[PDB]
Amino acid sequence: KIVNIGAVLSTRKHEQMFREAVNQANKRHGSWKIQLNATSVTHKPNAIQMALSVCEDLISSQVYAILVSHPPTPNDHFTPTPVSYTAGFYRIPVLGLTTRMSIYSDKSIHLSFLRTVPPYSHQSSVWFEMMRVYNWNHIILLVSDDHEGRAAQKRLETLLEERESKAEKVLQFDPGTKNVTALLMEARELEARVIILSASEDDAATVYRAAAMLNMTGSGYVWLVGEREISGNALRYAPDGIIGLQLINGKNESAHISDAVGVVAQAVHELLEKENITDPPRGCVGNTNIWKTGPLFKRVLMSSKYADGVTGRVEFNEDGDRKFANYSIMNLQNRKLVQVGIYNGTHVIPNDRKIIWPGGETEKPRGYQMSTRLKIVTIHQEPFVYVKPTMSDGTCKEEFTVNGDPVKKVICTGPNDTSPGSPRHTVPQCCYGFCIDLLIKLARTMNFTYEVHLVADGKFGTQERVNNSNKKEWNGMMGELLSGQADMIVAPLTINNERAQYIEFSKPFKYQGLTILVKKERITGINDPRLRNPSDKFIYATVKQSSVDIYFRRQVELSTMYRHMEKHNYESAAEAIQAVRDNKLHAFIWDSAVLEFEASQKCDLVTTGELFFRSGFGIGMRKDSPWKQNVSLSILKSHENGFMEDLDKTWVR
Amino acid sequence: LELGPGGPRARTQRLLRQVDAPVLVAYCSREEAEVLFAEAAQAGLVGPGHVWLVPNLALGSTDAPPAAFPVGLISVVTESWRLSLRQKVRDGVAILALGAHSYRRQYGTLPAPAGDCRSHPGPVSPAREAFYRHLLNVTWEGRDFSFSPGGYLVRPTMVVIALNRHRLWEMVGRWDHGVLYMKYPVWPRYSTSLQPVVDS
Amino acid sequence: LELGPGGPRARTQRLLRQVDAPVLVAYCSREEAEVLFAEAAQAGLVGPGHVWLVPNLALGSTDAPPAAFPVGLISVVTESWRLSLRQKVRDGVAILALGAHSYRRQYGTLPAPAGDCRSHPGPVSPAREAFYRHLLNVTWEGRDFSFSPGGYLVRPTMVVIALNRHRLWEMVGRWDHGVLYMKYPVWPRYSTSLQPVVDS
């Protein structure tokens, strides 16, 4: 039994190296009777003629495995495709030595394909590690629209989703298209200062020139790119201080040939014990069935720890890709590509030199540039946020407390519009109260300026399925905070699990619960049989798109509760209270903090039962906002000294 | 699972023994589907109380299904599943002819024929990119054959078929336009695969 | 399994690669234990994600354990573990002497000496039965040496020993009376390179 392997090369000289390497491999092994044989063929220009060349010689001979290399001149995924298809027809394993494209990782297209070199997509992994090293969280994924960009983005998103994080935004750059300036203009607005690029040489050069035009290469920014973006045309126009990376061996054909023949021989020896070896198809013509042993040969070849190779230990993952690697990190320091570290496979190891960031700084920059002018959204809640009309001169009535203290007021832009339906005019008013006083204290403590505006639709916000679609989208202050119109929510927003997945909540600044308001006392909580057996006799309702809606919708035990509620929800809390007092609605379920104040001030109404959902009000921010801790600390401090007691006494008597 | 000709008999019976589900959606090739159904029969997973659904990958040459397939297996195919080879050839020829006719009536000239292996084109010619787009949106004999950019069929008239008592693949429902036309108001179950009776 | 010398090796290897339990209990002789552990090491069932437990039978000379035994093996033995030979001989002679002393205290005389194999005393010789009954329950140096009617040690204090990283039989826990005390609040697990792994 003579086990023959084959190779398709280009240089006509590396085939002699492959013959030498296979001869050495034959000189060392368990058995020496298999008489390992080798054959080789040079590359052909025509792809169809190339595939026919694979069918002849290689396939015609009794070959067990095929190796394929790539000519030095970059031609991308064009040369190994025909041999991969032809050998995958018979499930004959094909080992790639220099190709880097991720299209060959898809086992649906290329069935029997393994590679000894990681693809371009795997680079994203090291980026994650770097993001762990420097604690960067806000990133932008500027990736091409081709398969490579989609694969890199998908892998990075998978890694990020394994952890608790998410990329700020991705930007699809269509290959070969000029004017990428729109994407850079969009990315300049965002808070993230870490730019990640995945594109070819021409695309990388184009985006580098466009970013130089937009001055996005200055101080504070961080650029992380791949191998294709620090070579060829890209390196010429690349801005200084970018951090790229490159594989250690990369193009050392001889190392990848020796390391491949060693593992192939080890695999052959390993599976030869079980025998049941089926001879190869012996020619494309005269056979239409796959080689039966082929699948098992590939399966045993994938799990083969050949830890004596030129390029280190060889191991393959579930998709037939070389598990580990070593990436050298490159910095463009004064037009020179200097090495500053080596990625062992799980952690980057910095040994010598110092990273020079693009702005010229010698100190690690944080990955965000939080602005000073802060847009803050708020809603109209009577005990917390009083909204009053401003006089014709642009400021509203001056007022003082009963004790004799000046009431601080700010200017806000609310939905006041004479036109019916939606708000069609944002006429300014003046806002004050508990939340605005807290906001003023917070802004004084944290040294930032603010612009306060009211929510567009008068709702707190729950995610709901968008019309003519199947996905759910947020609305209200929730939607405006997530979209970007507002940067912080200072309002009585109830903390709950649904909102905490997308919004970051500070420490609660007001503990409260949910209670029931009726006319001025035969209701005990939400467990009374009348409230468990809905009917026209006792009607109960809440505010649409609020925390109570979410609470009842997320309860399996209270489905009928929400079913009855859905028929009578109200636009706002104030109109619901007015309807209840006027004997148009029987019971109104709402927060204790507001309901108790309404019952105390306006009287003629009573709160019944004990609080059945204890929660707190919190300042809402975008996910992973850098200044969450600040605010939380301040809130805790306000609880400690005297501030929340004074705010309670002054506003909610 | 880990199916295949012969393979590792174990580690499938143990896993299939503790799956507590009344309806199962399986994805596997024809031989793998046969092995999985045989193992499930040995695992007490077929018969009434267990409904199987598979894509076309499990179905092979629907003219005659293997005996290992359990009665009540449900799948979804295209409308042309019951057509003959000649009818399918006619439909493909009609698709190409209508695409060429649309190209001719748009540009006022017949489509340019292709070449051969020598002198590979490289960048797709604008004429090719227009003939392809014209070939994409084509409707023939009521049924629409619009092709997605990926190359498959978008919004086709799909039929949900199932294996009957007499082990013959027959249509059970249609899809047409986003609306299901099921001929069984209640899904039937049959005495098949009731060797221990307790499986009922 | 077979676990015999020079037999089917594909069968054991195939079966051992199909198990995925995190806790494995084995029962075999010393040589069979070594064969099984070598195969499991080949089958990747030795790393920190697999804990093995064996009774006394799989163990051999506790002073010199073989290299096939994985680190983290657990077994349970009596107090005779780590005792010297002379101490064991003294304990046995003490048990017999205390039995004879109890017999003398009860009946005022020593039990009759044993006969010889060139005879068959059919009669049960109730004196000898009384001596045996006295020999059953006996305590010495604060340790219980009661014997079950089946001729084995009943309710003895036992120690649970484990093979630490230094490849020595360290004692982990004890079984005084019906209660268990163990040294380690959490079970350590070492990598295949004898590198302490901590579960994330």
Ligand SMILES: *[C@@H]1O[C@H](CO)[C@@H](O[C@@H]2O[C@H](CO)[C@@H](O)[C@H](O)[C@H]2NC(C)=O)[C@H](O)[C@H]1NC(C)=O
């Ligand atoms: C071992 O490999 C050599 C590779 O050269 C094979 O020699 C080739 O055999 C094919 C088929 O007979 C011929 O078409 C080529 O012209 C041969 N090449 C050379 C350089 O002689 C040889 O046949 C193989 N041994 C086997 C298959 O037993």
Ligand SMILES: *[C@@H]1O[C@H](CO)[C@@H](O[C@@H]2O[C@H](CO)[C@@H](O)[C@H](O)[C@H]2NC(C)=O)[C@H](O)[C@H]1NC(C)=O
């Ligand atoms: C890409 O196209 C946009 C058009 O939307 C160009 O944007 C204009 O650029 C000029 C000069 O830079 C400005 O005076 C205009 O105000 C821009 N218009 C807008 C709407 O922004 C942009 O310059 C083009 N870029 C390239 C590289 O061609």
Ligand SMILES: *[C@@H]1O[C@H](CO)[C@@H](O[C@@H]2O[C@H](CO)[C@@H](O)[C@H](O)[C@H]2NC(C)=O)[C@H](O)[C@H]1NC(C)=O
């Ligand atoms: C690929 O790598 C190998 C080793 O990593 C290189 O082999 C070295 O070659 C030089 C001269 O060519 C010798 O002085 C060294 O001793 C060789 N290394 C060893 C370990 O023996 C080989 O040159 C590399 N090929 C390329 C194209 O860079």
Ligand SMILES: *[C@@H]1O[C@H](CO)[C@@H](O[C@@H]2O[C@H](CO)[C@@H](O)[C@H](O)[C@H]2NC(C)=O)[C@H](O)[C@H]1NC(C)=O
């Ligand atoms: C990346 O480079 C390191 C060298 O620092 C390689 O580590 C070698 O690993 C082999 C086998 O694991 C050992 O025999 C060598 O002693 C190690 N080198 C040193 C200096 O300790 C590592 O294998 C490389 N990565 C890959 C995927 O090959």
Ligand SMILES: *[C@@H]1O[C@H](CO)[C@@H](O[C@@H]2O[C@H](CO)[C@@H](O)[C@H](O)[C@H]2NC(C)=O)[C@H](O)[C@H]1NC(C)=O
């Ligand atoms: C609060 O922020 C303002 C603006 O960021 C700070 O004012 C700057 O103060 C530095 C020195 O402290 C000056 O060099 C800048 O020119 C000032 N800018 C403006 C616009 O006034 C202020 O110092 C901060 N308060 C602190 C740090 O307590």
Ligand SMILES: *[C@@H]1O[C@H](CO)[C@@H](O[C@@H]2O[C@H](CO)[C@@H](O)[C@H](O)[C@H]2NC(C)=O)[C@H](O)[C@H]1NC(C)=O
């Ligand atoms: C949270 O508040 C702390 C103050 O205790 C901030 O720490 C200071 O931050 C400024 C600028 O960020 C530095 O110039 C100071 O040196 C920091 N002080 C100390 C003692 O380190 C912290 O930055 C705030 N958090 C955020 C996200 O801004």
Ligand SMILES: *[C@@H]1O[C@H](CO)[C@@H](O[C@@H]2O[C@H](CO)[C@@H](O)[C@H](O)[C@H]2NC(C)=O)[C@H](O)[C@H]1NC(C)=O
């Ligand atoms: C099928 O698609 C083609 C191309 O998308 C349509 O061709 C267009 O026809 C209109 C008028 O008939 C022209 O104004 C467009 O310029 C054509 N598009 C081109 C040339 O790309 C064709 O009309 C579609 N079929 C039907 C029945 O509408």
Ligand SMILES: *[C@@H]1O[C@H](CO)[C@@H](O[C@@H]2O[C@H](CO)[C@@H](O)[C@H](O)[C@H]2NC(C)=O)[C@H](O)[C@H]1NC(C)=O
């Ligand atoms: C071992 O058990 C035997 C009986 O099971 C004990 O012998 C008994 O001793 C009591 C002393 O009060 C007598 O009343 C009984 O008649 C004895 N029974 C028999 C069968 O001999 C004996 O004492 C126990 N051993 C020790 C050391 O206490």
Ligand SMILES: *[C@@H]1O[C@H](CO)[C@@H](O)[C@H](O)[C@H]1NC(C)=O
């Ligand atoms: C090898 O093939 C024989 C039949 O030729 C079969 O009985 C046996 O199970 C096979 N062994 C394997 C696949 O390990």
Ligand SMILES: *[C@@H]1O[C@H](CO)[C@@H](O)[C@H](O)[C@H]1NC(C)=O
């Ligand atoms: C609110 O809108 C009405 C109608 O447009 C307008 O008359 C009124 O002046 C607005 N309020 C304020 C404070 O300007």
Ligand SMILES: *[C@@H]1O[C@H](CO)[C@@H](O)[C@H](O)[C@H]1NC(C)=O
């Ligand atoms: C909203 O969805 C309905 C279908 O439920 C559709 O009829 C209507 O046209 C959609 N409206 C808009 C503005 O898309």
